[PDB]
Design a protein around this ligand. Structure first.
Ligand SMILES: Nc1ncnc2c1ncn2[C@@H]1O[C@H](COP(=O)(O)OP(=O)(O)O)[C@@H](O)[C@H]1O
Ligand SMILES: Nc1ncnc2c1ncn2[C@@H]1O[C@H](COP(=O)(O)OP(=O)(O)O)[C@@H](O)[C@H]1O
Lengths: 300, 300
């Protein structure tokens, strides 16, 4: 058996990267925070980075976060930052909606620079608030993007005096000097990428509603994940109804059906069940109470 | 303003093609049948054709339908058929998931033949039960597919004796004989296609749940429809909850949010509201009862 709990994850002290993803307002952001909070109780320090363009990480903790890692107010070991994509005009010029799917060299480089920073901070574990868009796993092309750049750059190093200062490239670029930045970012990117592909160090937590369109987008994201080689073994099924009002009962009979499907398809998964709450899960005190149900199965 | 009723549509006696689309088990099939049943009351005769691979058109009426138009059991002017796609091995050989998105010449031709049949029957109006897949509007490529064929076919017809029957093509294809079937299938496809692009003659009715993923997939499918120039001005919002049980009330508060969004975006639309019923809408009597609500807004 595999209990309906994220306990197996919280207990892993070798985990360094924990992704949280889910498409279409199923409560991905709420789960990212809840998982982070519950991790602060067990790990030395927890960094919460967000690739999400809505930056709901703020509206959630009701506190403004930037590209600088700040401390989540009610905590001492929990910190959060919001990463900016930083795609360039060049990035764009270099490229139905899969037309903007491949990252540019400038965007990939910027992310590598942020991972560099993050490593310096020496945060114990990192909860990765993924983007609930079409490009959830876009950052997984950064290794191949930088390698292709490092290659086209080295192939150019072979194209190289009396002329002195006037004898350099027009535009001022220093090839052997960029070949360093590029090699250094590529190495940083590759370290983290092979960490991602290590089940002992990196796992992916799916969030979903018990509707069709969500259950679908979920199996579709787990396929993509399994292809890239990123471990996933936990599904959080959010906004569930639990047992004098008839029509509300019918809506629950349907949940039971979708819920049986999930329990069948993902037998090998922890399937965590969260109840729809009556108020928004916004406060820190509310996020706490909500987070408890990630480790202690809810009961009426 | 625009009342929450499909009444405006049932009143258009110039309508010949009425599409029903909706992705993800939101009650598309049920709407297609309901809309036809309501149409049979006002129009001389109604044909219900289905591109939906699931052929839920049977499970809905509890009656087996084929590629031959049969009469729906409890009716006298309502008939249903289920179109088979008929993609060939060639078709496949000639080609993410947008890899099988362009139809083959053999599939396009087959559908043209069916449209040909259907025009012979002289049904007053047709309800078009679309496929709730990623290929909902796939048939709209048939004109361009057949035109490219008729072209490549005509070009070979300029590159073609004392050889007698030995002077034929190998394969036995008769070019001038095919240039006819192809011209005739193109002409049937074009007729029907320029009808689709006529608001007086063709409109598209969308079906959806009040969830995000569906409200999204809906604005997405309307965009594509508008691009192809196919008229759309009605949304059916299915499975809604209506006003001692607290947690169900919360689930309704969320619907209210989604429903307000819909009323705002689709101000120019008829936004029909359907309740979640306690039993499946399967029987003919149950479909009738459901279909009445497409023209008489539901109240507690
Ligand atoms: N189990 C739940 N019960 C009640 N409200 C919830 C629940 N999960 C999420 N919410 C609320 O619904 C919205 C979900 O937003 P969020 O958690 O950010 O999902 P996403 O980040 O995917 O949009 C937020 O207002 C959140 O407070
Ligand atoms: N408003 C409703 N109330 C209760 N049950 C419904 C309603 N709409 C659809 N259903 C049932 O839910 C399922 C919807 O299936 P269907 O109508 O075929 O949608 P789709 O064709 O998109 O799958 C069917 O069992 C149908 O009987």
């Amino acid at each position: 058996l595999m209990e309906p709990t994220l306990q197996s994850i919280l207990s892993q002290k070798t985990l360094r990267w924990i992704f949280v993803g889910g498409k279409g307002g199923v409560g991905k952001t709420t789960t990212s925070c809840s998982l982070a909070i519950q991790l602060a109780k067990v790990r030395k320090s927890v960094l919460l980075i967000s690739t999400d363009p809505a930056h709901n990480l703020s509206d959630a903790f009701g506190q403004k976060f930037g590209k600088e890692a700040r401390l989540v107010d009610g905590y001492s070991n929990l910190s959060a930052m919001e990463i900016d994509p930083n795609g360039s005009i060049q990035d764009l010029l270099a490229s139905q909606d899969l037309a903007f799917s491949i990252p540019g060299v400038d965007e990939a480089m910027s992310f590598a620079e942020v991972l560099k920073q993050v490593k310096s901070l020496s945060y114990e574990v990192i909860v990765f608030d993924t983007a609930p868009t079409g490009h959830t796993l876009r950052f997984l092309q950064f290794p191949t993007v930088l390698e292709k750049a490092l290659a086209k750059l080295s192939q150019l190093s072979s194209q190289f005096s009396i002329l002195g200062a006037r004898g350099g490239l027009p535009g001022g670029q220093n090839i052997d000097e960029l070949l360093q930045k590029m090699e250094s970012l590529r190495e940083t990117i590759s370290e983290v990428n092979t960490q991602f592909k290590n089940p002992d160090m990196t796992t992916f937590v799916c969030v979903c509603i018990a509707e069709f369109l969500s259950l679908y987008e979920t199996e579709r994201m787990i396929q993509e994940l399994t292809s890239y080689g990123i471990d996933t073994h936990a599904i959080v099924v959010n906004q569930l109804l639990f047992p004098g009002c008839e029509q509300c009962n019918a809506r629950r009979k349907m949940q039971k059906k979708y819920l049986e499907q999930i329990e069948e398809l993902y037998e090998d998964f922890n399937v965590v069940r969260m109840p729809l709450l009556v108020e928004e899960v916004r406060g820190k005190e509310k996020l706490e109470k909500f987070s408890e149900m990630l480790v202690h199965p809810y009961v009426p």
